Amino acid sequence: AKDDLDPEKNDSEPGSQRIKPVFIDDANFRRQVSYQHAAVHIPTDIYEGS
Amino acid sequence: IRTIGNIVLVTTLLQFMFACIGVQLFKGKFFSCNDLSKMTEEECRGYY
């Protein structure tokens, strides 16, 4: 989560591989959501890839 | 610049010697991170 979803970005940090999900819009959530997997929130000053 | 031989020689020997002592004391120790919280190169990754 909190990463650009634009396909042309392709940062590809070592150790990790992202997902581009498809994001249907929803009710009971008033936001677009994907039911195929779980997002991950890393806080900002924490490096991911540690 | 022709009457300075023995003294310059002593002096350039000094400079060199001290350079060596310095390399033996501070070799690979003048590295640091942006936020002085990380002590390794592995640690200083990401944002702060």
Curated annotation (Swiss-Prot), chain A:
Expression tissues: Skeletal muscle.
Glycosylation sites: 10
Compartments, record wording: Membrane; Cell membrane
Mod. after translation: Proteolytically processed into subunits alpha-2-1 and delta-1 that are disulfide-linked.
Note: Binds gabapentin, an antiepileptic drug.
Quaternary structure and partners: Dimer formed of alpha-2-1 and delta-1 chains; disulfide-linked. Voltage-dependent calcium channels are multisubunit complexes, consisting of alpha-1 (CACNA1), alpha-2 (CACNA2D), beta (CACNB) and delta (CACNA2D) subunits in a 1:1:1:1 ratio.
Annotated domain remarks: The MIDAS-like motif in the VWFA domain binds divalent metal cations and is required to promote trafficking of the alpha-1 (CACNA1) subunit to the plasma membrane by an integrin-like switch.
Protein family (similarity comment): Belongs to the calcium channel subunit alpha-2/delta family.
Function, as annotated: The alpha-2/delta subunit of voltage-dependent calcium channels regulates calcium current density and activation/inactivation kinetics of the calcium channel. Plays an important role in excitation-contraction coupling.
UniProt protein name: Voltage-dependent calcium channel subunit alpha-2/delta-1
Biological source species: Oryctolagus cuniculus (Rabbit)
Covered residues, full protein: 129 to 178 of 1106
From Swiss-Prot, chain B:
Location within or outside the cell: Cell membrane, Sarcolemma, T-tubule
Source species, domain of life: Eukaryota
Disulfide-bond pairs as recorded: 33-44
Tissue expression summary: Detected in skeletal muscle T-tubules (at protein level).
Processing after translation: Phosphorylated. Phosphorylation by PKA activates the calcium channel. Both the minor and major forms are phosphorylated in vitro by PKA.
Transmembrane segments: 7-26
Family, as annotated: Belongs to the calcium channel alpha-1 subunit (TC 1.A.1.11) family. CACNA1S subfamily.
Domain writeup: Each of the four internal repeats contains five hydrophobic transmembrane segments (S1, S2, S3, S5, S6) and one positively charged transmembrane segment (S4). S4 segments probably represent the voltage-sensor and are characterized by a series of positively charged amino acids at every third position. The loop between repeats II and III interacts with the ryanodine receptor, and is therefore important for calcium release from the endoplasmic reticulum necessary for muscle contraction.
Quaternary context: Component of a calcium channel complex consisting of a pore-forming alpha subunit (CACNA1S) and the ancillary subunits CACNB1 or CACNB2, CACNG1 and CACNA2D1. The channel complex contains alpha, beta, gamma and delta subunits in a 1:1:1:1 ratio, i.e. it contains either CACNB1 or CACNB2. CACNA1S channel activity is modulated by the auxiliary subunits (CACNB1 or CACNB2, CACNG1 and CACNA2D1). Interacts with DYSF and JSRP1. Interacts with RYR1. Interacts with STAC, STAC2 and STAC3 (via their SH3 domains). Interaction with STAC3 promotes expression at the cell membrane.
Free-text function comment from the UniProt entry: Pore-forming, alpha-1S subunit of the voltage-gated calcium channel that gives rise to L-type calcium currents in skeletal muscle. Calcium channels containing the alpha-1S subunit play an important role in excitation-contraction coupling in skeletal muscle via their interaction with RYR1, which triggers Ca(2+) release from the sarcplasmic reticulum and ultimately results in muscle contraction. Long-lasting (L-type) calcium channels belong to the 'high-voltage activated' (HVA) group.
Protein name per UniProt: Voltage-dependent L-type calcium channel subunit alpha-1S
Organism: Oryctolagus cuniculus (Rabbit)
Gene name of the record: CACNA1S
Included stretch of the parent chain: 925 to 972 of 1873
